[PDB]
Amino acid sequence: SASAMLSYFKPLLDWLRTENELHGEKLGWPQYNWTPNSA
Amino acid sequence: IYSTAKVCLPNKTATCWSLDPDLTNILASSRSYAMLLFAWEGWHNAAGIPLKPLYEDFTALSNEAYKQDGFTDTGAYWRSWYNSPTFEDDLEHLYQQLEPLYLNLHAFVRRALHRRYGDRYINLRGPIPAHLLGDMWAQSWENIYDMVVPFPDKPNLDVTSTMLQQGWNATHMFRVAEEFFTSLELSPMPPEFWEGSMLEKPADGREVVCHASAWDFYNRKDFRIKQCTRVTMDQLSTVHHEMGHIQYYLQYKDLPVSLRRGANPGFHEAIGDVLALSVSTPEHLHKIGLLDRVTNDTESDINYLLKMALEKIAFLPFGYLVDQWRWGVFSGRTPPSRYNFDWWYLRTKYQGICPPVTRNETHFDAGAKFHVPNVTPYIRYFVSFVLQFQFHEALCKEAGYEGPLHQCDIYRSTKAGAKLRKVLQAGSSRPWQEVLKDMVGLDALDAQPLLKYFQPVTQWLQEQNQQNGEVLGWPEYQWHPPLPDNYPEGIDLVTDEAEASKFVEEYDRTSQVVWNEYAEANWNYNTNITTETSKILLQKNMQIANHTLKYGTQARKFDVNQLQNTTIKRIIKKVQDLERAALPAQELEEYNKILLDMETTYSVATVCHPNGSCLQLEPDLTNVMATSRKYEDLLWAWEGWRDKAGRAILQFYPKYVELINQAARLNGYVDAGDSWRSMYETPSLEQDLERLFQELQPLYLNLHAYVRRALHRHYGAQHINLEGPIPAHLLGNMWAQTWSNIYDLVVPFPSAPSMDTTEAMLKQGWTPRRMFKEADDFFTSLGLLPVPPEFWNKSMLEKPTDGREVVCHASAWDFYNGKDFRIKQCTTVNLEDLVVAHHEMGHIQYFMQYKDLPVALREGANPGFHEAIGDVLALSVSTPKHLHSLNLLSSEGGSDEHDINFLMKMALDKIAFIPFSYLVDQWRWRVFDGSITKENYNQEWWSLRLKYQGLCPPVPRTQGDFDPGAKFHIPSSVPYIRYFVSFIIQFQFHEALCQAAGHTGPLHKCDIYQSKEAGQRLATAMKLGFSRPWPEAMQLITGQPNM
Amino acid sequence: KYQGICPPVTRNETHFDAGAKFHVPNVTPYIRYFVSFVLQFQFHEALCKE
């Protein structure tokens, strides 16, 4: 099970959620076709 | 404990079945293996398990009492009544005389039961299961007679309406039976009876419900009967039996108290049953006024004697069996640890029946019989059954009628009545042997009269068994039926052939009319989107939905595996699943709303410049994506259409996936993709399709390389890379499924103009009416069904606008209006119009061909044959030879240039489509699987587009674009692998038809015109419809059952 | 019933398992061995009593 692993990182998960919401970060990679070269 | 024994279902409802009249009726009426087995096992457990210790203690006590009395046993005391030192040996010889009759009857009934219940539950060389026949103890097989009638054409002489029509009382039958008694100078009947006995159901008070006893008041002056009354012939026979018992009671009044029982203990039943034999015969009924005339026919005699032999012969192993087991128990040969063992050994050895379930020493199966707990000897019934035919033969020989023994009543037989009275006078005063000798002529029991009575039916049974060729009985013991999955909750599923057939016919007849009304409403709506036909369409949709739900719930009560048919089983299985009616009402309404929203949003969305002049998908965006050779305009159209349609349907798709998956789960499957794949009835469809795609990969790769080179030569090297995928918007199609529009860019030999002539000169004529007439003319010339004239008198096809605002489709509609099939499509002036016309003509011919099949079996095998049939003839129509014929081009040549140009056009039509057809459903199957989630709907779609088709996005496609939504078939829940299967199948069909029609040489120049053998083989494989699986039609068309 | 022995395979009337015993074809009574087995112990007990 992953319950122990999730409970290990619970403070960090909460802090990361708070910071991402504050910064307006969107989870995931919506522009999946992006590439640094960009031709 | 025997009396208050009950069995009830695992649901633990407030009621529990009792032996009478619940369990007996269930075992005599229900032809369900699971329900019969549940009743049998439950009753035997309930009435036997709590009785074992009581019976052991009773056996000990009774043996002690009768050993103190002087007899060695209780069984010896029971045998002492018959007064014979060798009683068991005479009984054994008697049964060994009657064994072949029961063996033939057992084989016949076992064959009939095998035809009924199949081969899984019944062995043609083993014993019959002990619950599938007649009673619970299998003592009498009368209730089996329904399914084992020798000649079912004639009506069985078991009628109650004739009694009611003549105005028979509820008590006058006793009077006419009394006058029948008095006819043979008998019945010195006391006047106390009618004024001191009741023969009627209890009108008031809670007395006994019903029984078959005649309690006598005794007192040497008065007697009585307590028995119900009915209007059946069985009631009349039982009345005659009971009055025979009363007559026996009368004739020994003068004898002392202990000398009241009549000779042998079986003499009572023998005297009661000889008269019943002499009464139930049809000729007595005719001459008494209960029948119009005698049916002096062999078949009626056989039917009557087989009905009589189902109770008077099937009981012979019983009685003998029961008292043999009880004698063994009393003797100590059967200890309490061997009750069930010896019981079932005797049951299989004599009766030839095996327990439906596994039994063991916990059970006491002999205790479910009534006479074991209520301690009454049972050999009296065997003795009486043997004796009654001896008495019948003696009276008949003494009645002066030496003919067949069946129609041999003793009515108006003075001497027979005198002999009967003379025997009846002495009850136990003299040994029974002297009485039997005085009446019959010999002092011992004889089985010869019983054989003589059943001689014609015996000969018939032996002859029929020899013709059917079966073993006489149980050469394969140790066989027990497999459990029917008797974990007791699936016992109420009806598995009857008659009920299934009746349901199938009712479903057919109601479905025909309801589906015709729905088809008419759909035709009215689509032909004219104005005049508010949407309301009628919605009404017909509601009618279809509720009808489908009702009949699917009705068919869910049936079964599939236990059905002993092919067509009925197929229909029941195909009706048991509700495509969308399995959802609850709220979810069903939500699903309908989601589907309608997706379809309307796709059909309405348009993209265009901010100038103001605006374009729709068809025929504006398609035209600007077909005839425009420019990166900017093609990219604008592609991006705009994808934007509009896909971003509109993205907000709807995930909920649609959820709802369709829920419906498929409720229907039995695990996914909507699994439900769609089940249309082909192949458990390994994906592997076969992947194998076919791998087989066809090299040809597509070569064509892709050539088209890529041509596009690079035209557009340049900035937009096209020689190594790398080609952008999806440069192939002359919105979805790049077919690359036919860029043929002028990819012409192999420009100096071979033998295909541009068609559309160049079609302006000279070629009306839609005349071209469809030519198409059906070719259809008929092939050797197929001509089109009914209503297609021209009633139906229309030329509907460019026709006062409606719906984009053009290429569909075919069918309805069982006797003979009516009509189509709709937008008609242009080009060769593709003729190709699609032939495709729709093939659709309509497929509609015609399976006309006589049931409505549920109106499908064309798997839904890939339906599309393949029209394209098969379209392939032969488009050949240059068939274009030169019927004047579709100026001139044709077999040179390499024209042939290569024609093949390139056909390739850009079909090969370019192979990957797309496989890709659409491949993505959709992974979406329904849960493998593709909402976050990467687009990413996996474009991964598939690059992997299979080899195309690249012209612009960066982000998440939230939903490119797959721009395809029409995706926001319409229309499966798409059918086009892959059809494109694979049609070339096999073309090759097989050419081979049957000859045309040795290249396949692409073969023409199916004037091929009677090919047409007849196509018809003989198309007439199957959906009745048989598609490999059979594949085998008939081609010769191999594989794609 | 007597020996508490079940066949290892499914048997039926095509077979004749009583013939696999030696004494059945070469017809020789077999109850003499039962009688002798009982009688030898009867004799042993009586002799040791005397």
Ligand SMILES: *[C@@H]1O[C@H](CO)[C@@H](O[C@@H]2O[C@H](CO)[C@@H](O[C@@H]3O[C@H](CO)[C@@H](O)[C@H](O)[C@@H]3O)[C@H](O)[C@H]2NC(C)=O)[C@H](O)[C@H]1NC(C)=O
């Ligand atoms: C067994 O016992 C019964 C009961 O006692 C005997 O029945 C009775 O028989 C006597 C004569 O033995 C009857 O009496 C006679 O009846 C008529 C009346 O009209 C008449 O003939 C004489 O005046 C005389 O009274 C009697 O009615 C009859 N029943 C009773 C209830 O007593 C029976 O005979 C005995 N059976 C044998 C085989 O001995």
Ligand SMILES: *[C@@H]1O[C@H](CO)[C@@H](O[C@@H]2O[C@H](CO)[C@@H](O)[C@H](O)[C@H]2NC(C)=O)[C@H](O)[C@H]1NC(C)=O
């Ligand atoms: C039996 O049915 C008849 C039908 O009428 C009832 O009365 C009989 O009537 C006939 C004609 O008048 C008389 O001759 C009979 O004596 C009557 N009795 C009979 C046949 O028993 C009679 O009441 C009915 N009996 C019932 C219903 O118990």
Ligand SMILES: *[C@@H]1O[C@H](CO)[C@@H](O[C@@H]2O[C@H](CO)[C@@H](O)[C@H](O)[C@H]2NC(C)=O)[C@H](O)[C@H]1NC(C)=O
């Ligand atoms: C019903 O038909 C059978 C024959 O199917 C009749 O049997 C007759 O039996 C007598 C016995 O003495 C023979 O002599 C006759 O030749 C038989 N008749 C034939 C063969 O036609 C029987 O009598 C018929 N019963 C009735 C009531 O009609």
Ligand SMILES: *[C@@H]1O[C@H](CO)[C@@H](O[C@@H]2O[C@H](CO)[C@@H](O)[C@H](O)[C@H]2NC(C)=O)[C@H](O)[C@H]1NC(C)=O
């Ligand atoms: C069992 O299958 C047989 C064989 O198909 C069925 O007989 C046909 O049933 C179809 C049902 O649509 C009818 O159209 C045919 O006319 C039947 N053939 C005849 C009557 O020869 C049969 O109905 C099925 N059911 C039973 C109970 O036998």
Ligand SMILES: *[C@@H]1O[C@H](CO)[C@@H](O[C@@H]2O[C@H](CO)[C@@H](O)[C@H](O)[C@H]2NC(C)=O)[C@H](O)[C@H]1NC(C)=O
């Ligand atoms: C009697 O027992 C045999 C042995 O199990 C049964 O099986 C078949 O026996 C025949 C020869 O009698 C062999 O050729 C077959 O290979 C056996 N097996 C099968 C599956 O057929 C045999 O069926 C039994 N006989 C009867 C009459 O039931």
